[PDB]
């Protein structure tokens, strides 16, 4: 959200909000420089070779999809200057999202969405799940485990394949059992995608793209994501609800109620677990403090005795906010930008962009800069009218 510090990539490490860290992902990875831009939110200006052991190399595979479906450059985001621009780009997009009431609400929900402490085998002990933390190097070279909700990280091999990644549990389905897990969003502010509205060729505002992933992240942080195997005529349920607008109508109402009820019961389990709890692992967190943190997250009701329960009214509000109010469609309305009308894009294009310079893109106007000839008719997003801002890869 509000990012109160303007980071430069070369800013000196301080072990607090600028640090070298390691990701839970097994293997002895080299520590990477990361920046804490807000409570619970970090940015790692590196290509993601870390979250998936089968995706550790950036070269195009022999059978790669071609532009504009995929795009490959093993050297993208390999230099200090690129990483600085990436950090600054990602930060600007957070400000753009935060500048809307809707984005302010979403970013708040995200910060509150601490992944549940369901790490213990003793059903009376509260314990953090290791894969919801990062290890932060300290001055003496020791590591300090820090909980976090969200990491923005550079893309893996396919530069334009953005998505939410998270570490799984051996038995728990964290993004689908109400628990939640730290979300790693593969994202780049340095490219964007085209759509058609000889029809004009427009570019998606990167803030909409990022907001889209943040919506996925919200579902996944509250453990209410829909299994990708659930689709409607086909596109996944999870994508249709996230995109919103016209295409949401293809979601089966009954199926929608099934999941609302399902996740209702999942929240109830969480409340019972909290009630049961007697021990807690760690240091700066009292069990009372954590119970309160999760009361806050799941909007639980608490009686005089201190017992937790789920309020169906509060639950309905929260669920609707996360699944119906936070949509790409609704963000487009708040940004007042042009966006493709339907989830599936049959006229794709890919462009290199640079959002960082003020002459190019602003927190308040994106590409459609007020008091320029780019202000009207979404001229700023028109790849032919605003051609200096969009370099077509193919
Ligand atoms: Ni229709
Ligand atoms: Zn999506």
From Swiss-Prot:
Residues at the site labelled Transition state stabilizer: 340, 343
Post-translation changes: Has slow autocatalytic activity, cleaves 250-Tyr-Tyr-251, 266-Phe-Gly-267, 419-Phe-Thr-420, 423-Phe-Glu-424, 430-Cys-Val-431, 432-Arg-Gly-433, 438-Lys-Thr-439, and probably 429-Leu-Cys-430 over a period of 4 weeks. Catalysis of the '197-Gln-|-Arg-198' bond in SNAP25 is estimated to be 10(5) more efficient than autocatalysis, leaving the physiological importance of autocatalysis in doubt. Ubiquitinated by host HECD2. Deubiquitination by host VCPIP1 prevents degradation by the proteasome.
Classification lineage: Bacteria, Bacillati, Bacillota, Clostridia, Eubacteriales
Superkingdom field: Bacteria
Record's comment describing the protein's domains: Has protease activity.
Active site: 213 (proton acceptor)
Species for this entry: Clostridium botulinum
Phenotype for residue 239 to A: Light chain has 20% cleavage activity on SNAP25, 40% decrease in Zn(2+)
Name of the molecule in the record: Botulinum neurotoxin A light chain
Residues bound to Zn(2+): 212, 216, 239
Residue ranges the record marks as coiled coil: none
Compartment list: Secreted; Host cytoplasm, Host cytosol
Function: Has proteolytic activity. After translocation into the eukaryotic host cytosol LC hydrolyzes the '197-Gln-|-Arg-198' bond in SNAP25, blocking neurotransmitter release. Recognizes the '146-Met--Gly-155' region of SNAP25, which confers substrate specificity. Hydrolyzes the '202-Thr-|-Arg-203' bond of mouse SNAP23, but not in human which has a different sequence. Reduction of the interchain disulfide bond occurs in the host cytosol and probably prevents retrotranslocation into the synaptic vesicle.
